[PDB]
Every structure is written in C-alpha cells, then in structure tokens.
Amino acid sequence: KPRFPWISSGSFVEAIVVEGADANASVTGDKNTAPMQLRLTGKVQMPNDEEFDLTGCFVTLEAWGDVSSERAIVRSRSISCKLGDDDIDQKIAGHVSFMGKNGIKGEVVMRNGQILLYAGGAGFLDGIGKGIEKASSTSSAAKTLSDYYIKRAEQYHPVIPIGAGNEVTLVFQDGFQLETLEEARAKAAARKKQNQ
Amino acid sequence: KPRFPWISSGSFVEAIVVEGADANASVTGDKNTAPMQLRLTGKVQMPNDEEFDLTGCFVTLEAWGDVSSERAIVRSRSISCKLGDDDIDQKIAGHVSFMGKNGIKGEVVMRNGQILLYAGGAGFLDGIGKGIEKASSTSSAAKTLSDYYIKRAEQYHPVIPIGAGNEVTLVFQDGFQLETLEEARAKAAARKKQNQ
Amino acid sequence: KPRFPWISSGSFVEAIVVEGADANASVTGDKNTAPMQLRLTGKVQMPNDEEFDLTGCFVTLEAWGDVSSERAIVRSRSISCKLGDDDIDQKIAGHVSFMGKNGIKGEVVMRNGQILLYAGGAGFLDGIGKGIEKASSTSSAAKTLSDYYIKRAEQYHPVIPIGAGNEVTLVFQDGFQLETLEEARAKAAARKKQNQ
Amino acid sequence: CAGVKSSFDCDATTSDTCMTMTKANQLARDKAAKQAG
Amino acid sequence: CAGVKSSFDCDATTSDTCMTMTKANQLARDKAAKQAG
Amino acid sequence: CAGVKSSFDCDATTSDTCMTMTKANQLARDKAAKQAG
Amino acid sequence: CAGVKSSFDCDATTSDTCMTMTKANQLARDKAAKQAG
Amino acid sequence: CAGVKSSFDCDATTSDTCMTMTKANQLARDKAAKQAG
Numbered sequence: 054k055p056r057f058p059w060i061s062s063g064s065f066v067e068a069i070v071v072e073g074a075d076a077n078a079s080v081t082g083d084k085n086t087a088p089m090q091l092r093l094t095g096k097v098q099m100p101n102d103e104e105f106d107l108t109g110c111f112v113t114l115e116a117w118g119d120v121s122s123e124r125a126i127v128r129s130r131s132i133s134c135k136l137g138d139d140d141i142d143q144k145i146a147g148h149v150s151f152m153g154k155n156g157i158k159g160e161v162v163m164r165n166g167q168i169l170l171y172a173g174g175a176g177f178l179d180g181i182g183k184g185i186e187k188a189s190s191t192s193s194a195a196k197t198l199s200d201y202y203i204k205r206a207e208q209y210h211p212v213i214p215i216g217a218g219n220e221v222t223l224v225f226q227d228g229f230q231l232e233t234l235e236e237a238r239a240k241a242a243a244r245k246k247q248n249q
Numbered sequence: 250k251p252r253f254p255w256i257s258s259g260s261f262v263e264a265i266v267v268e269g270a271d272a273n274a275s276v277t278g279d280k281n282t283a284p285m286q287l288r289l290t291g292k293v294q295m296p297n298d299e300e301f302d303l304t305g306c307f308v309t310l311e312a313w314g315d316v317s318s319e320r321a322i323v324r325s326r327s328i329s330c331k332l333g334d335d336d337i338d339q340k341i342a343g344h345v346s347f348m349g350k351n352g353i354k355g356e357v358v359m360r361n362g363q364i365l366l367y368a369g370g371a372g373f374l375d376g377i378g379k380g381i382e383k384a385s386s387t388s389s390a391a392k393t394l395s396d397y398y399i400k401r402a403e404q405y406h407p408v409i410p411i412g413a414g415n416e417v418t419l420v421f422q423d424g425f426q427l428e429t430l431e432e433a434r435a436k437a438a439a440r441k442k443q444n445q
Numbered sequence: 446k447p448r449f450p451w452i453s454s455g456s457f458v459e460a461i462v463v464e465g466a467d468a469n470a471s472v473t474g475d476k477n478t479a480p481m482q483l484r485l486t487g488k489v490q491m492p493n494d495e496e497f498d499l500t501g502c503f504v505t506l507e508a509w510g511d512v513s514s515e516r517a518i519v520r521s522r523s524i525s526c527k528l529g530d531d532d533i534d535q536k537i538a539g540h541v542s543f544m545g546k547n548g549i550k551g552e553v554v555m556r557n558g559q560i561l562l563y564a565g566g567a568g569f570l571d572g573i574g575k576g577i578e579k580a581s582s583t584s585s586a587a588k589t590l591s592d593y594y595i596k597r598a599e600q601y602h603p604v605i606p607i608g609a610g611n612e613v614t615l616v617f618q619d620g621f622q623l624e625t626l627e628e629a630r631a632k633a634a635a636r637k638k639q640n641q
Numbered sequence: 642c643a644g645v646k647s648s649f650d651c652d653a654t655t656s657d658t659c660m661t662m663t664k665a666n667q668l669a670r671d672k673a674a675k676q677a678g
Numbered sequence: 679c680a681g682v683k684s685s686f687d688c689d690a691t692t693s694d695t696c697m698t699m700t701k702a703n704q705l706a707r708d709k710a711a712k713q714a715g
Numbered sequence: 716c717a718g719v720k721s722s723f724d725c726d727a728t729t730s731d732t733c734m735t736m737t738k739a740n741q742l743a744r745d746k747a748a749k750q751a752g
Numbered sequence: 753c754a755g756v757k758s759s760f761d762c763d764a765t766t767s768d769t770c771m772t773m774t775k776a777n778q779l780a781r782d783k784a785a786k787q788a789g
Numbered sequence: 790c791a792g793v794k795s796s797f798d799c800d801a802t803t804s805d806t807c808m809t810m811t812k813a814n815q816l817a818r819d820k821a822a823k824q825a826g
Contacts, residue, residue, distance in 0.1 A: 059336045059430065061329035063286055063307030065267075067663060069706035071457075072616065072699055074547040075514035080404065087518070087547050088540050088618050090455055092492075092703065094710045098666060100288075101305035101331040108710045109493035111455030113618060122271035122408045123360060123686075126283070133453035133620060135493040140451045142620050148284050151692070153413035153662050155270040155283050158691045161360075163717035164515060164553075167792020169394070170716065173371075175565075176390020179572075180375075184382045186576045192389075193584075194568020197591050198561070199393050201599065205791075207397065208472065212514045214723060216694030217545035217702040222662045224268065226284050226309060228329060228338050234451065263774060265669035268662055288666065290673045294777060304673045319649075347655070349773050354654045359680035363718020366679065401717075410686060412657030413665040418773045459700060461743035464736055484740065486747045490703060500747045515723075543729070545699050550728045555791035562790065606797060608731030609739040614699045651770045659688045696725045733799045 057231035058105060060097070065224045066107060067095035068149070070157075073217045076125040078118025078161070079210035086117045089127065091149065091221065110134040110141070112223060114149070118213045124156030125213045129223070139233045147225045157221060159213040168206040175199045253427035254301060256293070261420045262303060263291035264345070266353075269413045272321040274314025274357070275406035282313045285323065287345065287417065306330040306337070308419060310345070314409045320352030321409045325419070335429045343421045353417060355409040364402040371395045449623035450497060452489070457616045458499060459487035460541070462549075465609045468517040470510025470553070471602035478509045481519065483541065483613065502526040502533070504615060506541070510605045516548030517605045521615070531625045539617045549613060551605040560598040567591045 074089035076082070091112050096104045111134075116127035127149045134141035151157040179195035232240075270285035272278070287308050292300045307330075312323035323345045330337035347353040375391035428436075466481035468474070483504050488496045503526075508519035519541045526533035543549040571587035624632075660668070697705070734742070771779070808816070 059338075061307065061331060061336055061338055062327050063309050063329045065286075065662060065666075069702060069709065071702045071706065072542050072547065073545040073694065074542075075511075075516060077513070079513075088616075089547060090457075090616060090618075092706045094706050095714065098663070099331055100307040100329050102670070103331050108714065109707070111453065111492040113455050119271075120404060121273070121275075121360070121406045124271060131454050131619075133455045133492050135453060135491055135495050140453055142451075142453055150268050150270075150662050152688060152690055153269040153657075153660055153665065154410075154688070155268065155285060158688070160691065161719040162723060163719045163721045164513070165717045166721050169397075171792060172397075173390055173394055176388075176393065179390055180378060180388040182572060182576070183388070184378070184385050186579050187382050187385045188387065189576050189579045190387060191580065191582060192568075192572040192575070193588060194565055194571055194591055196389060197568065197595055198565055199390055201561075201564075201595060203393055203397060204599075207400075208512060210513045211719065214546075214694055214725075215692060216696070216725075217699060218695045218697045218705060219692045224284075224286060224662075226286075227327075261773060261777075265665060265672065267665045267669065269657065288669045290669050291677065294774070298781070304677065305670070346773050348651060348653055349768075349771055349776065350651070354651070356654065357682040358686060359682045359684045361680045362684050367718060407682065410657055410688075411655060412659070412688075413662060414658045414660045414668060415655045420773075457699060457703075461739060461746065463739045463743065465731065484743045486743050487751065490700070494707070500751065501744070542699050544725060544727055545694075545697055545702065546725070550725070552728065553793040554797060555793045555795045557791045558795050603793065606731055606799075607729060608733070608799075609736060610732045610734045610742060611729045616699075650768050653770055657687050659690055694724050696727055731798050733801055 055230070055232070055236075058099075058103075060105075060225060060229050060231055061100055062225060062228035064097050064099050064228075065222050066093050066097040068092060068112070068221050068223050069094050070215065070217055070219045070221055071111075073215050074116055076116050076118030076159070076213035076215060077210060078120045078125075078213050082117035082119070086115050088130075089114045089116050089215065091223065093223065107134070116215070118211065119156070120161060120211050122156070123161055123213070124151075124154070124158055125215050126156045139235075141231065142234060143229065143232065145225060145229050146227045147223060149221050149223050151219070151221050157213075157215050157219070159215050161211050162214060163209065163211065165206055165209050168202055172199050172202040172206060175202065251426070251428070251432075254295075254299075256301075256421060256425050256427055257296055258421060258424035260293050260295050260424075261418050262289050262293040264288060264308070264417050264419050265290050266411065266413055266415045266417055267307075269411050270312055272312050272314035272355070272409035272411060273406060274316045274321075274409050278313035278315070282311050284326075285310045285312050285411065287419065289419065303330070312411070314407065315352070316357060316407050318352070319357055319409070320347075320350070320354055321411050322352045335431075337427065338430060339425065339428065341421060341425050342423045343419060345417050345419050347415070347417050353409075353411050353415070355411050357407050358410060359405065359407065361402055361405050364398055368395050368398040368402060371398065447622070447624070447628075450491075450495075452497075452617060452621050452623055453492055454617060454620035456489050456491050456620075457614050458485050458489040460484060460504070460613050460615050461486050462607065462609055462611045462613055463503075465607050466508055468508050468510030468551070468605035468607060469602060470512045470517075470605050474509035474511070478507050480522075481506045481508050481607065483615065485615065499526070508607070510603065511548070512553060512603050514548070515553055515605070516543075516546070516550055517607050518548045531627075533623065534626060535621065535624065537617060537621050538619045539615060541613050541615050543611070543613050549605075549607050549611070551607050553603050554606060555601065555603065557598055557601050560594055564591050564594040564598060567594065 072090035074087040113130040129147040268286035270283040309326040325343040371394045464482035466479040505522040521539040567590045
C-alpha cells in the first residue's frame with residue numbers, strides 16, 4: 054500500500070489564513086481574481102472517525118468576490134508539503150468555509166466618497182441655478198464637470214478586505230490520492246516508456 | 250453476493266448539514282451555484298422495512314436558490330465513505346428535503362438598503378425642486394446620481410442563508426449499487442482487458 | 446541530489462523594495478506596466494519548518510495599479526543570484542504581499558487640480574452670464590475653452606506611488622526547481638544532442 | 642398585496658446558529674451515537 | 679428599503695488585524711503545537 | 716457617499732522616504748546581516 | 753369579478769402539518785398494518 | 790480639485806542647470822575619480 058491513505062471527497066481540515074487578499078467583487082470577479090495563501094493547522098478530519106496528520110503544509114488559493122452575500126468565494130489552486138525528505142506539490146479542487154458557511158465573511162468598501170460628492174455638488178449648483186435663472190427671467194460648465202466626474206467615478210468596483218490571522222476550514226470538494234514528487238516522476242517515466 | 254445490498258430509488262437517510270452555504274437565488278442560480286456538504290447521522294431507511302447502517306459517511310452537495318418558494322434547491326454531487334479498510338467514492342443523484350418539503354427553508358436577504366435609499370433621496374430632491382422651479386417661475390445632478398446609483402444597485406441578487414447544525418433528510422432519487430474503490434478499479438481493468 | 450532543494454509552491458521570503466515605481470492605475474494598467482525591483486533580505490520560509498538561505502539575491506518585478514483597493518498588483522519577472530561562483534537567472538511566477546495583504550498599499554494621486562479648476566471657472570462664467578443675459582433681456586468662448594480643457598484633462602490617469610525602503614514579502618505562487626546557469630546550459634546541450 | 646393567500650402554514654425555518662463547521666462534525670457524531678443508540 | 683428582511687443573523691465577521699504575513703506563520707505554528715497538543 | 720462602509724481598517728501604508736535606490740541596497744544588506752544574526 | 757361561477761364545490765384541501773419526512777414513514781407503516789388489518 | 794490626494798511626498802526634482810553637454814562629461818569623470826576613490 055502507498056504511504057498516503059486515499060483522501061476522500063468531503064474531508065475537512067482547519068486553517069490559518071497566512072496571506073490576506075482584496076477580492077475583486079464586481080461583475081467580472083471570476084475572471085480578474087487575486088491570489089491568497091492559507092496554511093493548515095489541524096489534522097484532516099476524514100469521513101468516518103478517521104484522522105490524518107497534515108500540519109504545516111502550504112496551500113495556495115485564488116479568490117474573487119460576491120457582493121450579494123458579502124463573502125469572498127475562493128478556490129484552491131495547489132497544495133504543497135515537505136514531510137521528512139519527501140516533497141508534495143499537487144493540484145486539488147476545493148473551497149474554504151468560514152463560520153460554517155462557504156466563503157469568508159467580509160465587509161464591502163467604497164472609495165467613491167469625494168468623487169461622488171463632487172458630482173452631486175457640481176450640478177446641485179446647475180439645477181438651483183436654472184431656478185435662479187427662472188427668478189431673474191424678465192450650467193454648461195456644471196454639466197461638463199458632472200459628466201467627467203461620473204466617468205471617473207464609475208471606474209471603481211466593490212472590494213472585500215480579507216486579512217491575516219483569521220481562522221477558516223479547508224474542504225476538499227473532490228477526493229484525490231496524495232502522492233510524492235519522485236513517485237509521480239517515476240510514474241510519468243513508466244507511462245512514457247510505453248510498456249506494450 | 251456483493252458486500253453492499255442494492256440501494257433502491259426512493260430511500261432516505263437523516264442528516265446534519267456540516268457546511269452552510271449562501272444560495273445564489275437569481276435568474277441564473279442553476280448556473281452560478283455554491284458548494285455545501287452534509288454528513289449522514291442515521292441508518293438509510295430502505296423501502297420495505299429494511300435498514301442499512303451508513304453512519305459517518307460524507308456527502309458532497311451543490312446548491313442554488315429559488316425565491317418563489319423561499320427554499321434552497323440542492324443536488325447531491327458525490328458520496329464518500331470509509332468503513333473498515335474500504336473507501337467509497339461514488340457519484341449519485343438525489344435531493345434534500347427539510348420539514349417534509351423538497352429543499353431547505355430559509356429567508357431572503359437584501360443588502361440594498363443604503364443604495365436604494367440614496368437613489369430615492371437624490372431625485373425626491375429632483376422632483377420637488379422642479380415644483381420649487383414652478384413656484385419661482387415668473388435637476389441634472391440629481392438625475393445623473395440617480396442613474397449611477399440605480400446601475401450600482403441592480404448588481405445585487407437575493408441570497409438564501411443556509412447554516413450549520415440544522416437537521417435535514419437526504420433522498421436518493423435514482424437507485425445505485427454501492428461499490429468499493431478497489432473493486433471498481435478491478436472492474437475497470439477487466440473491462441479494459443477486452444475479454445473477447 | 447542537486448545542490449538546491451526543490452522550492453515548493455507557497456513559500457515566502459521577506460524583502461526590501463530597492464526600486465520604487467509609479468503604478469499605472471487606469472483601465473489599461475495590466476498592458477501598460479512599470480518595472481520595479483526588490484532585493485531579498487531573509488531566509489525563504491519553506492512550508493514545513495524548513496528554511497533555505499537566500500540572502501542578497503535580486504528579483505526583478507513588473508507592476509500595475511488597481512484603484513478599487515488602492516493597491517499595486519505586482520508580478521514577479523525573474524530571480525537572479527550570485528552564490529560562490531554559480532550564477533542563477535530564472536523566470537518564476539509569484540506576487541508580493543504587504544501587511545498581510547496581496548499587493549502594496551499606496552495612495553492615489555491626481556495632478557488635475559488646475560486644469561479641472563479652469564474648466565469649472567470658464568463655464569461658471571458661461572452659465573451665470575446666460576442669467577445675466579436673462580436680466581438684460583428687454584458664451585461661445587467659454588464653451589470652446591471648456592471643451593478643449595476637458596479634452597486635455599481627460600488624458601491623466603490615477604498613479605500609485607510605491608517607493609524604496611519599504612518592507613514587503615515575496616511569495617512563489619508556483620513551485621520551481623532552483624538551477625544554475627551552466628547546469629541548465631549542459632541540460633540544453635543534452636536535450637539538443639537527441640540521445641535516441 | 643397580491644390576491645392569492647400570501648402565507649405558508651409551516652412556520653418552522655432554519656436557524657443559523659453560527660456554529661463552526663468543525664464543531665458541527667462532533668455534534669453530528671454524538672447524536673449518531675445516541676439517537677441510534 | 680427592499681422588503682425582504684435585510685439582515686444576516688450571524689454577526690461574526692473577519693477582523694483584519696494588520697498582522698505581517700510572516701508573523702502569521704509563527705501564530706499558525708505554535709497554535710498547531712498547542713491546539714493539537 | 717456610497718452606502719457601503721468606505722474605510723479600511725488597516726491604517727498602515729507605505730512611506731516614500733525619497734531614499735536613493737543605491738542607498739536602499741546598503742539598508743537591505745546590513746539589516747540582512749543583523750535581522751538574521 | 754369574472755362572470756363565470758368562481759367557486760369549487762369541494763372545499764377539502766391538503767393540510768401541511770409540518771411533519772418530518774421521516775415521521776411520515778412510520779405514520780404510513782402502522783396505518784398499512786391497521787387499515788389493511 | 791479631484792478628490793484623491795493631489796500631492797507627491799517626494800519634493801525633490803531634477804534641476805536643469807543649463808550645463809553644456811561637454812562639460813557634463815568632465816563633471817562625470819572627476820566624480821568617478823573621487824567618489825570611487
């Protein structure tokens with residue numbers, strides 16, 4: 054039997070977010086994402102009263118944002134380990150849940166205060182000035198500034214601040230077989246050798 | 250006979266939602282879904298006074314939302330088991346019912362309070378200001394802000410909060426034959442061997 | 446075994462930004478980027494209580510801007526080393542995190558003060574002058590100047606000032622095998638020799 | 642108010658108790674040990 | 679204010695503590711040494 | 716002012732100290748000699 | 753009010769009793785044991 | 790005035806001193822002789 058027991062789908066291990074990332078939470082989040090990395094701190098709790106020791110391994114992640122639920126939807130990229138003299142580097146698919154819920158809870162932040170204020174002001178002037186003209190009866194500059202300022206303000210997109218020190222749980226959403234680098238290397242050689 | 254008795258269509262087993270997920274409940278829910286995982290806690294009640302012991306197995310799920318009934322319509326992805334020295338990892342099709350009803354009951358939450366308020370205010374000013382001009386007779390800024398704020402507010406989509414600790418019932422909507430990994434592995438080898 | 450241990454994905458090493466760069470933070474940042482270079486100052490902290498000494502090596506970077514989070518999203522270009530008599534020059538993929546967060550924190554700067562003021566003024570004259578005409582009842586120059594000044598002002602794009610002396614952390618987001626120049630050179634010769 | 646009766650007659654709903662994913666596993670395990678008995 | 683209840687019932691959120699990436703590694707390591715025990 | 720909370724809770728930012736590129740190299744070198752120790 | 757008679761003459765309807773799916777199985781089983789008899 | 794802070798914090802800039810291209814070569818040469826030393 055191989056040294057590593059089969060890791061089944063559904064298993065979960067506790068973690069400490071080492072790298073904090075700003076999640077792009079706009080309509081194009083899942084294309085323009087931000088890297089983020091978590092370290093494992095507990096033993097993988099396998100499905101039926103089974104525990105495997107995986108402490109100190111580094112897991113690389115990749116994440117975007119979701120404004121409706123105010124959470125950061127993250128996806129695992131790879132898992133790296135260094136036990137004894139054997140190095141692990143594998144691609145796995147999984148997600149991270151915080152406080153019993155998929156994703157990491159965070160707030161939504163806008164840096165649009167000054168720009169949006171200026172737009173309002175510029176034309177608050179424009180409109181009451183149209184009424185001032187109605188009074189003097191016996192705006193172009195404000196309109197142009199409003200247009201430019203709206204064009205600048207629309208650029209910004211909601212961001213979800215996810216930092217470091219937080220405690221999360223990593224879930225392997227598909228099961229995989231933990232394998233070492235040299236063993237996988239030997240396998241690749243055996244497959245290429247074409248043992249017909 | 251194989252070790253596992255044939256699991257028939259219709260069987261149900263009680264469960265405890267381990268992973269809570271936010272269900273995307275908009276017009277595109279079934280495409281953009283959120284992962285969620287449940288553990289079994291009872292014995293599968295088979296159709297005719299038959300019981301099979303399946304305790305501690307992990308079932309991976311995948312779920313979206315439905316605003317009309319205020320429920321989360323979920324679909325099973327895979328089932329994983331670790332009994333004795335035999336590991337199970339199979340794809341099954343089924344749904345989850347809560348309180349006697351398909352899906353999990355939850356509320357609908359909107360994070361649109363401030364944005365929708367601002368839109369209203371901006372033009373509540375615009376309109377009464379048009380009447381103020383009717384009075385002074387002898388808005389552009391509010392319109393632009395309203396347009397931008399509506400464009401931002403339309404982004405959000407209803408979410409169904411489903412958490413952990415809740416008690417649900419998992420149903421196998423199509424029957425399947427429980428099989429081990431090595432046995433299925435051997436079968437694959439036998440099928441590939443082309444015993445003509 | 447090779448002299449350099451396998452560098453796994455996820456490893457991190459502390460650094461001191463030697464070259465400061467102005468990050469182009471507009472809609473086309475990731476195409477029009479600015480070079481920037483960081484030196485390593487600590488030992489790479491490998492995944493499981495493992496440390497490798499890499500001090501004094503130069504890492505070349507390339508960076509753009511992101512206004513939503515007010516951070517500079519940077520990408521590693523290459524890593525160069527000079528240990529003993531062996532020179533290293535390799536392409537690696539990784540990012541840089543500051544204060545526990547991907548990217549480097551910085552402010553946003555606009556040089557549009559005078560130009561935007563002039564636009565406002567020019568037509569603030571235009572509009573009240575239309576009301577002055579409403580009074581005298583019994584602008585073209587301002588409009589043309591406003592148009593030209595807006596056309597000039599739109600040229601500018603937000604910039605993120607990132608300077609030198611700051612302390613950051615470099616992360617290898619994909620794992621790589623550290624190799625020397627002559628060794629890689631010999632490998633290239635062996636591969637070209639076509640040992641069939 | 643849409644005319645059709647706008648009320649379910651179930652009342653009971655889920656109760657997010659903000660329990661850590663991990664602690665839910667133990668809560669499931671001992672219940673399985675006791676509820677089955 | 680959109681009609682549907684606009685409040686989560688979890689309260690708990692993340693807390694950016696501005697801790698250096700590196701110091702988080704030590705914070706993870708000793709906790710692993712103690713929490714596992 | 717956009718409704719969502721418009722404030723980060725980190726405070727700390729970078730500090731351009733207008734230090735010559737070259738002097739930064741020495742500042743990195745002695746720190747490496749001392750911080751590692 | 754649409755002209756055609758707008759009333760069914762059945763009255764009886766279903767009654768959601770919020771009974772757990774599982775308990776319905778036992779409710780079906782003993783009834784089968786007794787109703788058939 | 791655009792809202793974002795409109796000021797660099799470096800201050801130092803270049804100083805055109807209208808020095809002939811040629812004289813700059815000598816200015817570079819003796820500095821190399823002295824700064825290196």
